[PDB]
Symmetry: C3
Subunit: 31 residues, 3 copies
Amino acid sequence: EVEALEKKVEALEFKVQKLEKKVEALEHGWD
Amino acid sequence: EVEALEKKVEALEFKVQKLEKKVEALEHGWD
Amino acid sequence: EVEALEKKVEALEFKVQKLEKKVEALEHGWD
């Protein structure tokens, strides 16, 4: 269960960092 | 603690997938 | 490993709640 959690958490971290970048661009009107 | 983590991770996954869909729409100008 | 996971999950929760607020504003045209 723990390694299952570790994989999902690392996957969630990647996804959340991508979302933060995209949302920062929309908020800032970048590009 | 582990089942506590599993619940939160599953909740985070739902929330992150919803965010991805909404942000994809804003980026693509859907609808 | 478990406390490592707990820290990251709590960090992810903070980040996801912030993303939800920002995206709700963009979707609603707030402000």
